[PDB]
Structure 1
């Protein structure tokens, strides 16, 4: 069949197509989070920018997986993309809790694919994930944990004040 494929299992090829769907789902989730915080009755610009940047980051992860699929001689296959889990995302705290749950689900999927690649003795796959995904994910989850702690300390007796101050003084606008 393939003129270039070498040491690239059907199991890894399939798992890469599934991981693309997970990253595009995550990208779509962040697009929805961004436009919720852009609503005139929510109006938290720095929160909107935080999640819009993540929509782009997750799309770029999908793009790198698809590029690698073709570099290895697998076939990119696209499936339907489910809509995000919510239409309205609550407070900045609710949204950042949803985001860290989403990132730990992507991180577990990365770790599971790395374990498959290790079992299949596919060092190019293992290095690819180590070099472009695992540390990106650890650093993002650490950032979200930092943000969750600062959001939680600002709730106090005065949730609205804390939510304003976090968006103004931690996030970019």
Structure 2
């Protein structure tokens, strides 16, 4: 509320609420990816677990944002959460590419929020994003990059065999 609010622009407040919805949607997407790979006709446990962990990670993300919103005196506003872009996600490489695209979108949103925070000279918001979000995304994107390179290395006519080995030996 107004009693504790200090140097917290209404623009950042609104942008933080927007970011919260983006994280809710990312978490929802990983939930879908997680259970897709648990289907009896896909059956890649390691892949399922990989995405379910990410869903959990994104949840912590929006919870941390919601907490910060209250600490600065902002007010959280919730909107509908759009369903995942796909009902079925293809094979592991396909799903990893979609995950990569999603993380880059999230990272760009974090970068945009930081630029907005800098423009409004809000050092606390800047520190918050850098400490709890920016490095986390960089490492995650690097890991997905590594996975994609290994999946591609396992492609070809015996791609099925490769997908199995990757799930067994890497995930």
Task: Give the TM-score normalised by the residue count of structure 1.
Answer: 0.98
Residues 1:139 and 2:139 aligned together: yes
Task: Please name the residue that 2:129 is paired with.
Answer: 129
**Partner SS for 1:78:** coil
CA separation in 2, counterparts of 1:56 and 1:24? Answer: 11
Deviations 1:54-104 (A, max 9, x none): 000001100000000000000011100000000000000000000000000
Task: Please name the residue that 2:73 is paired with.
Answer: 73
Task: Please name the residue that 1:48 is paired with.
Answer: 48
Task: Please name the residue that 1:170 is paired with.
Answer: 170
Query: Structure 1 residue 157: deviation in Å?
Result: 1.9
CA separation in 1, counterparts of 2:160 and 2:147? Answer: 17
Residues 1:103 and 2:106 aligned together: no
**4+ runs deviating over 6 angstroms:** none
Task: Give the TM-score normalised by the residue count of structure 2.
Answer: 0.99
Deviations 1:78-137 (A, max 9, x none): 100000000000000000000000000000000000000000000000000000000000
The answer for unaligned runs of 5 or more in structure 1 is none
CA separation in 2, counterparts of 1:13 and 1:169? Answer: 44
Alignment size in residue pairs: 171
CA separation in 1, counterparts of 2:15 and 2:101? Answer: 21
**Partner SS for 1:38:** coil
Task: Please name the residue that 1:37 is paired with.
Answer: 37
Task: Please name the residue that 2:157 is paired with.
Answer: 157
Query: Structure 1 residue 156: deviation in Å?
Result: 2.5
Report the aligned-residue RMSD.
0.6
